[PDB]
Amino acid sequence: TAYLSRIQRGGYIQPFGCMIAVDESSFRIIGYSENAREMLGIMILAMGTDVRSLFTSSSSILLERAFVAREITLLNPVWIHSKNTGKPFYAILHRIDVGVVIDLEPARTSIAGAVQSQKLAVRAISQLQALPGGDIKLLCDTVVESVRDLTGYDRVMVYKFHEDEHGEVVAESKRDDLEPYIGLHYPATDIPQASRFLFKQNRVRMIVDCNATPVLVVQDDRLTQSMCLVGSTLRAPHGCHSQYMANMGSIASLAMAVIINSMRLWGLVVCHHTSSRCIPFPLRYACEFLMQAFGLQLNMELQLALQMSEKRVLRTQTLLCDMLLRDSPAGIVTQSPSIMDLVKCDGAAFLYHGKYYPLGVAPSEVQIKDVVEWLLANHADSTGLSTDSLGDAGYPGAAALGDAVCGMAVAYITKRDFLFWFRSHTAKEIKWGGAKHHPEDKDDGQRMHPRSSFQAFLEVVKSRSQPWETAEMDAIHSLQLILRDSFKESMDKFINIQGDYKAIVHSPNPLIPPIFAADENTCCLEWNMAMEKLTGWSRSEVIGKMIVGEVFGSCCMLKGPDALTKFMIVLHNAIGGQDTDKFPFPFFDRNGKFVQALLTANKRVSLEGKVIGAFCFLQIPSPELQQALAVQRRQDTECFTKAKELAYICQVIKNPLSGMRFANSLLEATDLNEDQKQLLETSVSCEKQISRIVGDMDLEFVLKREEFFLGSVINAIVSQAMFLLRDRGLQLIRDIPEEIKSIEVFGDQIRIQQLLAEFLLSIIRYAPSQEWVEIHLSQLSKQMADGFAAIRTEFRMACPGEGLPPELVRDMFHSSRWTSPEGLGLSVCRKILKLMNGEVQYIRESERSYFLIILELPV
Amino acid sequence: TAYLSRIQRGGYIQPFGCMIAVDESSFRIIGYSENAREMLGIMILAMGTDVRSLFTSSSSILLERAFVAREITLLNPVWIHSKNTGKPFYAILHRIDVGVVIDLEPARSIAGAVQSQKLAVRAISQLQALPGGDIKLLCDTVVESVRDLTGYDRVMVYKFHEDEHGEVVAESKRDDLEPYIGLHYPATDIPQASRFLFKQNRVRMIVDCNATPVLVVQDDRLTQSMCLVGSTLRAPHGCHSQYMANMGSIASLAMAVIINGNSMRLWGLVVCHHTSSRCIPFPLRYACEFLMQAFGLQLNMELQLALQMSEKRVLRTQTLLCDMLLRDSPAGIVTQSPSIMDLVKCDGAAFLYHGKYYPLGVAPSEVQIKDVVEWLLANHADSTGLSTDSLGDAGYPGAAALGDAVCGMAVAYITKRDFLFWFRSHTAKEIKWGGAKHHPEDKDDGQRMHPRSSFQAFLEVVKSRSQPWETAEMDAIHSLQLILRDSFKEDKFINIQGDYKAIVHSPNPLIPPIFAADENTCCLEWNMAMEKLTGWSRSEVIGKMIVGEVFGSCCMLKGPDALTKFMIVLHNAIGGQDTDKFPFPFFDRNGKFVQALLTANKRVSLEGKVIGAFCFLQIPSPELQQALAVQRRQDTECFTKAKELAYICQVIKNPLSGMRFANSLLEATDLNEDQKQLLETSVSCEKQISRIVGDMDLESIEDGSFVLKREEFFLGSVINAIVSQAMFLLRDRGLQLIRDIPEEIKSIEVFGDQIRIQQLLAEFLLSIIRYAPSQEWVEIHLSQLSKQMADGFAAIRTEFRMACPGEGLPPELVRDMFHSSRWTSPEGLGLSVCRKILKLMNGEVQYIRESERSYFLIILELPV
Ligand SMILES: *[C@@H](C)[C@H]1/C(=C/c2[nH]c(/C=C3N=C(/C=C4\NC(=O)C(C=C)=C4C)C(C)=C\3CCC(=O)O)c(CCC(=O)O)c2C)NC(=O)[C@@H]1C
Ligand SMILES: *[C@H](C)[C@H]1/C(=C/c2[nH]c(/C=C3N=C(/C=C4\NC(=O)C(C=C)=C4C)C(C)=C\3CCC(=O)O)c(CCC(=O)O)c2C)NC(=O)[C@@H]1C
């Protein structure tokens, strides 16, 4: 490991402090520094000098008290008064390989221990803890503000390492006469892995002056090996880091590690001062405690993000069970939870003995035959390819395919049948600082000097998409596995290609849950390989047996006070036509091993023969998601103040919705007035919004994208606010580019007119009475490829007036915080755009109004 | 035990079915009944005979496959035909230690456990969508469920109490009979033998008490009788038969309510009484067994909720105990918001310290308290604390002079004649027994053969008598006296109950593990309970900072982030911010992991605003700390549920304005008036939705009554709205509709809330279509009839009738509809609210079964 020998064993310190290596046994010096002779005033000092008699008697007994401790971190910093000049000195004790070593820093102007120093921190920590969760950026901004108002540095920032080991400055609280560093990515080789393990062990590290001379320590002659000083607050930085800071335009740096707990180094809070800044060790230990609280909240939010990822994998497992209950593989594309909802993507294709099935932005049949022919010639062995960019993969015609179909994930099914997923190009620009990260860059300890340039240069990725993770390829391989199993009714290599690195072959585990299926008598119809492996019982021995009593009562032991009844109530509900999701299922292995599974029993409903049955899977989440699902299953029984009225609305409203859509379905017959026919179409698109809104509900998802005229949305949204402008007199102004016959834009008509309802109505809400209002939309049918087009649409819903209040836009732009009904609705309809390829800004001018950009795709 | 041999080995069956006890190896008849030859119609059944010659060859393989199976219970009941006459049977077969007894009940389908349980499933899901915290609603639901299933005349929940006597906690019966609800019964009515029978055969059916017990025959060489503990066909004990005759119970069906945890304890019985001889088929008895299993599940959930609510109150008394431990004066106990009366629930409290009587609530005068103190010095001097339920049974004269108020007493003795008193006023506990009154000395006599002739509801009042002091409340008192005893410096407890011996004990105290941190986080005060918990002694950890070394270095805290969490929360305790029940999992100096609940609050010296931080630990059972986790995450779940409701109301309101604008702009031209009727049906649905998400919060006495729109309407709108609201589910299920409605084109001036009428009408009619069978008709009958209240105030009476030809809507769902504030499904919930709207709107609804199930509802509105 490059620089590990140099940094740790390099005996050079900074001139602001004095380090004194003394063995605890008899206060005998085994090391010292050159500036100690000046800053102490000692002008007797040698190897063997009793330093207990070099200070006040109070600080003598304090130092020998701080020697004999379990942990010495609590003691730091002991207040030590010197004797040869009388000036008090902070004394940062820490134990090293053979002895301890003090670190004397002069004090300008009483902190006797860690707790007194932490008392400064606790106010900022209390401000940091009382923060809404689910937004790392707000937490980082709170940390940089707290560290700025504590330390008094010019520019503090949160450097965050990525998965590539390269970092990015994700927060800033700079002094405003400087330049912003937010967004600037730095290479991995900029900070060596030796320095990051150094920060894992040391966790706070200041310098005072980079242009200061490195004061060398005097190593003991008897021991050849140099001192392995890691936890010293005084040791000078490497000649490379010192020159680097001289080139950076910041001569004082306080960097402290953001550990996330086994001991992942998430990032670094790096402070920068333009002048030479010192800071007392009580304030430095306060900021180390502030970094402890930062790591605390950050781990509390990364665990929540990983639990949301596990919930998303559980949804993917339910989707694969949906795909298992389909009569043909052609049904997958035809039906509504299709192959483009399995994976976050933009198109999806299925080739099934010809008659190619495209969804969204997918190549035509000739183009996909070119893709298939490239997949047969190259990557012949590997069943799955997950290329970030087709151009990097080597497929000819990638330029002809365009940026729209740049990313492609394929899965091979038998008999030359292929499953495809397609992704459009992501317009991400990385403002690299000095040097772009090179994935071939290893740690080069023979490099003397760092680059002098730090002008950030934007690097734009030309024709590549979002990366394909292991989870999405896991889902793709699982669905490919079930489709090949269906093929047998009537080994797998996967190549991952990304722009930064090169083609790697990885075998992905399937994501199929353990599945059994029973008929009305609870006799086994199905018991798949996953369930066979989990329980240990083979399918053949348990097929035909009674699931409710035999197989799970004796054969595969259940667990609980009375669990079998809980099982027998559940499966009889499945046969009876009631489905339970994520019912807890603690059962034992054949070999006596506990499994804390989550049973889901769905009715095996079919056509008018074999009407009802049971299909069940056994999702096994981590025990923190067992807890996270128990804390919401122990909470629907308590919110009976409003869950009764929610189920009351969600059941009673269904009947006049069916009457509305049956009157409107029978009213489509013979209405030859095309103005009235379009008006009825507006009513059908209005009734549908209520049925989609009530039926889908809100739980923040799935988008039922279909072909629709875009002018059929404005006409379906001018009629919602038209009562609110007919009574408040807002004579509206429209100027459209006639997006009637702007056909086939791919998306939700319903969720788009719901977000435009909650934005337009909020705009017309806060207008002056008997006025006007402007709506306007500028479309540009930008061609993206040979045959692929996209229509980018702004929405200028412009109103002159007082406008929405300043707090309600932060209500809208929250993550989980709300105080108003209208604000809640605004927040949800903003998150609807955050789920669907667009965003929304609120601008404040002489007219207070909403910009709204949605990118939709004419097939 | 008493009667166990007589019941288990009493070779007597009931005559409603025959019984053959075959072998387990080669199908020989080890035993049989006298009425086997008459039931099978044989008029060969003898010693050691092959049993499969009696039944049909096709039925024979069912018996053999039942024998091969490891669990005989699942196959039961195997439908078995007869070879000599062609008669069906239910051959319920169970395994005994010396063979396999097969019980033949003549059938008049179901061949297994699953088919039987399918009947129970609807009632089981009825009592599982029920709100927790109560037991009366649960036991009042299960009796209607069993009355719907069994059909017995009177079904009641006979809950056992702690001294083995039982009372009818909930009873459902037809309105002809005597109400048994509240009636306590002596513990000798149900012997320990019967309880141990119910713990291994949980459904017992007596077809006829009067009917003679048919004798068994046995070919077994060994001298023992057949085993009939598990057999459904076992004759009741003669005493129990006489008992049933003397109660008016001709037939009975007693079902065990076994609750168990991880220890099966029989909670109570669901005895079903019939005023005539009745037998229900074994599908229904096995269904009722499964329903009793679900009932035991719901009772287990209610008992665990009660246990953790008691333990939450235990932690609340510990919090109040430390609140009364940090006081400068001993007299602060009497006068503060968390008073001594708050510690242990009581009518009054009294603290005697160096005389100077400190009364609270209802308390006896100083002379009276001095006299009772003199009595407590004269008797029970040796024991410190006394908690007499009644002072009259304690032995104290002048209890009548004290009156009802000072009857119940709880005493804590502190040194140098210092006392703590809690007083409870006389609670009028009047428990009407049935027949005899239970005494705790009454044992189950093994040779008694005749029950009591009487079962009349005679009262039994109590004396000057209070609510019983519990173990936990006396424990709270015990901890309070110990902490006050230590506070002054800075064991036998007698409990007297009016029905029991004066029990002498000493309970485990509730002083929580306490450490007190100063401003520099150094443990000033260290409790003996911390020394019991972590093992660290006080005089070794003294003078050491807690956050870093006493906790982190000495005790192994959680590795990822417990040390940072503890340091932040203790420095916030020193910063004035008190925190309650922080999750604090840690290890000890022995090494055993111990999760806890750190509560850290600021300590005040009364001259310094926040000098020091006080702390105390509570250690719960893991269900309680998980319930505190769900108490914390209620702030995320319940507000997101309310957020879902408010979001739904607003975002639904927007296209309702779009809907009414589209349907008030569609009024240009509708050429055929059928198109205008479809349009007006859509307008009615839109107004219906705008009223469903209007200003109502689902109470019907504050919102549905205060907001009730009153406008004129025309009834063809309502009828075509109902048909349009129903046609999608009609065409989904392939049904017919036969709307036998007269002409109401001319009744334009009927004046009532039409939108609520079409809401309730569609809810009723779509429940009918939801439970109408596949591919048949549904009838909509109306009969508009005149009704007169005045010459100009004339009303109307329309009777909506909805009929379907089949099994129809299940009885559980109508029970949910008429229960009022109880619902199982959201469909039954909407039916319940649409029933309450008809109750509010001068009408009434019925569900009538006349071999084709029909829905009947009337309503009254006045034309103008
Ligand atoms: C006479 C010897 C004593 C006696 C004996 C006895 N009792 C049983 C079984 C039961 N007794 C029950 C009592 C009740 N029945 C009710 O309806 C109510 C209240 C509403 C009560 C309190 C019940 C119940 C049973 C369970 C059996 C059943 O079918 O219900 C037995 C065992 C009989 C058997 O073979 O199963 C015996 C020996 N009971 C008496 O009261 C006198 C003191
Ligand atoms: C030498 C050829 C290479 C080198 C060596 C090097 N760097 C460190 C430690 C740090 N480097 C940091 C880089 C940044 N400083 C910033 O302000 C930003 C972004 C805004 C970045 C990316 C940081 C931070 C550290 C930690 C602070 C610290 O003092 O450690 C070290 C370890 C030195 C030590 O102190 O022991 C070394 C050997 N860096 C280079 O860029 C060249 C290629």
mmCIF file of C-alpha atoms and ligand atoms in Angstrom, chain A residues 2-4 6-8 14 155 157-159 161 167-169 181 184-192 194-196 198-199 202 205-207 235-242 244-245 248 250 253-256 268-272 433 435 443-451 454, ligand 2:
data_model
loop_
_atom_site.group_PDB
_atom_site.id
_atom_site.type_symbol
_atom_site.label_atom_id
_atom_site.label_comp_id
_atom_site.label_asym_id
_atom_site.label_seq_id
_atom_site.Cartn_x
_atom_site.Cartn_y
_atom_site.Cartn_z
ATOM 1 C CA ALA A 2 1.510 3.268 -1.224
ATOM 2 C CA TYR A 3 2.283 6.028 1.351
ATOM 3 C CA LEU A 4 1.421 3.786 4.350
ATOM 4 C CA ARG A 6 5.750 7.121 4.825
ATOM 5 C CA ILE A 7 2.766 8.835 6.530
ATOM 6 C CA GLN A 8 2.612 6.674 9.670
ATOM 7 C CA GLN A 14 4.137 21.123 12.693
ATOM 8 C CA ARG A 155 -14.695 27.391 3.843
ATOM 9 C CA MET A 157 -17.194 21.331 3.001
ATOM 10 C CA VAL A 158 -18.388 17.725 3.040
ATOM 11 C CA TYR A 159 -16.233 15.604 0.761
ATOM 12 C CA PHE A 161 -16.331 9.286 -1.512
ATOM 13 C CA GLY A 167 -14.953 11.837 -4.081
ATOM 14 C CA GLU A 168 -17.341 14.743 -4.503
ATOM 15 C CA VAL A 169 -17.866 17.904 -2.450
ATOM 16 C CA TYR A 181 -16.729 24.004 -4.624
ATOM 17 C CA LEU A 184 -16.631 19.312 -7.876
ATOM 18 C CA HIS A 185 -15.505 15.695 -8.184
ATOM 19 C CA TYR A 186 -11.918 14.767 -7.362
ATOM 20 C CA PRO A 187 -10.025 11.578 -8.346
ATOM 21 C CA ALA A 188 -9.515 8.568 -6.114
ATOM 22 C CA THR A 189 -5.714 8.887 -6.345
ATOM 23 C CA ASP A 190 -6.060 12.435 -4.969
ATOM 24 C CA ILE A 191 -6.495 10.902 -1.510
ATOM 25 C CA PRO A 192 -4.709 7.540 -1.118
ATOM 26 C CA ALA A 194 -3.507 4.797 3.226
ATOM 27 C CA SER A 195 -4.850 8.265 4.085
ATOM 28 C CA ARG A 196 -8.391 6.905 4.263
ATOM 29 C CA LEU A 198 -5.490 6.731 8.510
ATOM 30 C CA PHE A 199 -8.748 8.675 8.809
ATOM 31 C CA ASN A 202 -7.536 8.925 13.558
ATOM 32 C CA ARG A 205 -6.654 15.912 11.584
ATOM 33 C CA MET A 206 -5.848 19.628 11.435
ATOM 34 C CA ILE A 207 -2.962 21.593 10.007
ATOM 35 C CA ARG A 235 2.457 15.356 12.720
ATOM 36 C CA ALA A 236 3.090 17.307 9.477
ATOM 37 C CA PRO A 237 1.309 16.185 6.231
ATOM 38 C CA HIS A 238 3.124 14.422 3.319
ATOM 39 C CA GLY A 239 5.274 16.614 1.023
ATOM 40 C CA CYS A 240 2.653 15.868 -1.633
ATOM 41 C CA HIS A 241 -0.361 16.967 0.458
ATOM 42 C CA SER A 242 1.509 20.104 1.710
ATOM 43 C CA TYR A 244 -1.241 20.292 -2.870
ATOM 44 C CA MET A 245 -2.696 22.681 -0.286
ATOM 45 C CA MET A 248 -5.237 24.872 -3.602
ATOM 46 C CA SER A 250 -5.873 27.370 1.372
ATOM 47 C CA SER A 253 -6.947 22.566 6.604
ATOM 48 C CA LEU A 254 -8.961 20.800 9.302
ATOM 49 C CA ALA A 255 -10.223 17.483 7.928
ATOM 50 C CA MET A 256 -12.227 15.059 10.069
ATOM 51 C CA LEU A 268 -14.744 13.716 5.018
ATOM 52 C CA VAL A 269 -15.718 17.086 6.450
ATOM 53 C CA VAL A 270 -12.852 19.259 5.206
ATOM 54 C CA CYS A 271 -12.328 22.798 6.493
ATOM 55 C CA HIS A 272 -10.252 25.392 4.638
ATOM 56 C CA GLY A 433 -11.408 19.396 -10.298
ATOM 57 C CA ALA A 435 -7.960 15.696 -13.014
ATOM 58 C CA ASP A 443 -1.930 4.308 -5.826
ATOM 59 C CA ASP A 444 1.370 5.677 -7.149
ATOM 60 C CA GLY A 445 3.674 6.262 -4.182
ATOM 61 C CA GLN A 446 6.515 7.190 -6.545
ATOM 62 C CA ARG A 447 4.669 10.351 -7.654
ATOM 63 C CA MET A 448 6.458 13.333 -6.126
ATOM 64 C CA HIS A 449 4.227 16.318 -6.785
ATOM 65 C CA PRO A 450 0.515 16.981 -7.395
ATOM 66 C CA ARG A 451 -0.949 18.894 -10.332
ATOM 67 C CA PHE A 454 -7.650 23.023 -9.922
HETATM 68 C C1 LIG C 2 0.745 12.910 -4.053
HETATM 69 C C2 LIG C 2 1.431 12.564 -5.390
HETATM 70 C C3 LIG C 2 -0.813 12.760 -4.166
HETATM 71 C C4 LIG C 2 -1.477 13.188 -2.850
HETATM 72 C C5 LIG C 2 -1.087 12.683 -1.651
HETATM 73 C C6 LIG C 2 -1.810 12.792 -0.339
HETATM 74 N N1 LIG C 2 -3.039 13.429 -0.011
HETATM 75 C C7 LIG C 2 -3.289 13.244 1.374
HETATM 76 C C8 LIG C 2 -4.499 13.767 2.147
HETATM 77 C C9 LIG C 2 -5.564 14.494 1.686
HETATM 78 N N2 LIG C 2 -5.806 14.957 0.334
HETATM 79 C C10 LIG C 2 -6.960 15.639 0.308
HETATM 80 C C11 LIG C 2 -7.511 16.252 -0.967
HETATM 81 C C12 LIG C 2 -8.442 17.280 -1.008
HETATM 82 N N3 LIG C 2 -8.382 18.497 -0.268
HETATM 83 C C13 LIG C 2 -9.497 19.276 -0.584
HETATM 84 O O1 LIG C 2 -9.774 20.380 -0.137
HETATM 85 C C14 LIG C 2 -10.231 18.477 -1.551
HETATM 86 C C15 LIG C 2 -11.497 18.864 -2.199
HETATM 87 C C16 LIG C 2 -12.103 20.044 -1.940
HETATM 88 C C17 LIG C 2 -9.602 17.287 -1.808
HETATM 89 C C18 LIG C 2 -10.074 16.218 -2.746
HETATM 90 C C19 LIG C 2 -7.564 15.655 1.697
HETATM 91 C C20 LIG C 2 -8.841 16.308 2.070
HETATM 92 C C21 LIG C 2 -6.721 14.969 2.527
HETATM 93 C C22 LIG C 2 -6.927 14.738 4.001
HETATM 94 C C23 LIG C 2 -6.398 15.930 4.801
HETATM 95 C C24 LIG C 2 -5.037 15.533 5.458
HETATM 96 O O2 LIG C 2 -4.300 16.451 5.885
HETATM 97 O O3 LIG C 2 -4.738 14.321 5.537
HETATM 98 C C25 LIG C 2 -2.223 12.494 1.913
HETATM 99 C C26 LIG C 2 -2.064 12.071 3.352
HETATM 100 C C27 LIG C 2 -1.273 13.167 4.075
HETATM 101 C C28 LIG C 2 -1.265 13.121 5.638
HETATM 102 O O4 LIG C 2 -1.735 14.096 6.273
HETATM 103 O O5 LIG C 2 -0.784 12.104 6.187
HETATM 104 C C29 LIG C 2 -1.300 12.217 0.837
HETATM 105 C C30 LIG C 2 -0.027 11.444 0.968
HETATM 106 N N4 LIG C 2 -2.619 13.939 -3.184
HETATM 107 C C31 LIG C 2 -2.630 14.269 -4.539
HETATM 108 O O6 LIG C 2 -3.515 14.907 -5.074
HETATM 109 C C32 LIG C 2 -1.406 13.718 -5.233
HETATM 110 C C33 LIG C 2 -1.861 13.083 -6.543
#
